[PDB]
């Protein structure tokens, strides 16, 4: 029952909500360029006493980096950003609490490794690992780091058959964990362009390792739990604003949060139309409570 | 269909019934670079008895003629003379045939190959030019640099085989080529793992194919076993009559399944991946498909047929 948002309805909701959780890409900005009116509306929400949070499935930037980008583009400051890097670090903290010196093989960014380092998890394998040796015997003979207790698959632009081989070898130990930052098929880019998502890499590792990975990012509930551990979210008085139906809006529906769809990003009203037709009850979960052309549309009520 | 143990008498009955024998290579004829004991003698005897022998492989790393050299070196024999034709059908050659048929009429077909030099050689033989074989290491600081790399014009297919040089760059180029609707996506096999000696394994081609499928939001066409195209690739040259042909294999999900779906008599050899315990599990109907994966006859090794060939 997607309602079209008007200034009157926006005022009504704003009275009801104290916390707003936003996806960054496709909602607040595309690339390094801000959505028209978005910085001012978020500044105004802060002035009206609303608490702002940010949830992202990208593992390439640290919390402080996302916060600096928000500050430079005028969105303000209080941390308020919850990305798959930080939340992956928290997951590994929880699942490796008993390990004395946990080490993880990270097919991912320096930011993911830094976030793991902050929670006490040493990371190995960030960066290039180009193929060496002419056959499987050479590839399977390469020495591995000792005491590796987890394999974390993030956005690895250096992904190679060597990293897949080392990951599978680490995962031959039953105690070893397999964690994926997200399961997205595509990473949205500017101008409607896209590149391969972390989900492709994670699925390669899963298939080779005959394992099912634990997914940290949206639509997984783990990212909401990571936000709630610090915010203490009240589902009834909290709203999730997002651009993608399969990740942001589904997360909102599963966690009983109010949902707003912004049409500045990947998803559009036509997609919601197909979802409103009952092919599956799940697709009904992928429908927003309200829709806005842009987040600046909250400025009339603010 | 009751997985009968092939006794020498039963084996002789089979020899009278079949004129053509199709063998899987790894786990049946040889393990790695070392031959299975007694297999070379058995196949040489089969050639002497006038039986026609063919070979089916899911590995895309060797050309037909190269496989023939390995067979000759290990004592399995070779095509007799000038009239005789090649006996080995691997995923490189049959992938080339698949693109030959599916790119019929294309003026100068080009393919982006995440695969071996052998696959490129076979494609050249069928008239398909190949681009992208070999390493493509990461360059640049961001997506704009990666997406600024120039792509070749008139690429009409993406072929994913065993690529140990697979990289995020090659995946990115593959999706960019596949953004063209006419472009085909072909996979040599969908195996999650490549079996190796001593129970070891490495990641299979299926992982690479799946990554490309997910990013391109496409479904790949698989050439290798259990897909029936490899059987059609054999038949295009052999002209097989299914009831008078036997398929010998080591793996239930690939070799024996191909035999059953193509109405070939099946012999399971226990020198490879599959065991009688696995066929036991399949004989218990957990899945409808598992009934298809049951051998008509079983032997510990193909050398077990040597008494009936003398």
Numbering used by the authors:
A (entry chain A): 12 to 89, 96 to 319
B (entry chain B): 11 to 320
Give sentences copied directly from the paper behind this entry.
Phosphoglycolate phosphatase (PGP, also called glycerol 3-phosphate phosphatase or AUM11) is an evolutionarily conserved metabolite damage control enzyme that can dephosphorylate and thereby repair three adventitious glycolytic metabolites: 2-phospho-L-lactate, 4-phosphoerythronate, and 2-phosphoglycolate. PGP belongs to the haloacid dehalogenase (HAD)-type superfamily of phosphatases, a large, widespread and evolutionarily ancient class of hydrolases with emerging roles in human physiology and disease. All HAD phosphatases consist of a catalytic core domain with a Rossmanoid-fold. This core is accessorized with so-called cap domains, which are mobile elements that can shield the entry to the catalytic cleft.
We had shown earlier that PGP exists in a dynamic equilibrium between homodimers and -tetramers, and that the mutation of Cys297 to Ser (PGPC297S) abolished disulfide-mediated PGP tetramer formation. For subsequent crystallization attempts, we additionally exchanged the catalytically essential Asp34 to Asn, which abolishes PGP activity towards its substrates. Full-length murine PGPD34N/C297S (here referred to as apo-PGP) crystallized in space group P1 with four dimers per asymmetric unit, referred to as AB, CD, EF and GH dimers. While monomers A-F and H are well defined in the electron density maps, large sections of the catalytic core of monomer G display very weak density. An inspection of the PGP catalytic cleft showed that the active site of PGP is organized as a channel, and that Asn34 (corresponding to the Asp34 nucleophile) is centrally buried within this cleft. Coupled to this rotation is a shift of the substrate specificity loop (amino acids 202–215) by up to ~6 Å for corresponding Cα atoms towards the catalytic core. Conversely, the cap domains (Cα atoms of residues 100–237) can be superimposed, which then identifies a movement of the PGP ‘flap’ (amino acids 39–46 of the core domain) by >5 Å towards the catalytic core. Upon rotation of the substrate specificity loop and the flap, channel entrances become obstructed, and access to the active site is blocked. To our knowledge, experimental proof for the existence of open (chains D and E) and closed (chains A-C, F and H) conformations in a C2-capped mammalian phosphatase has not been previously provided.
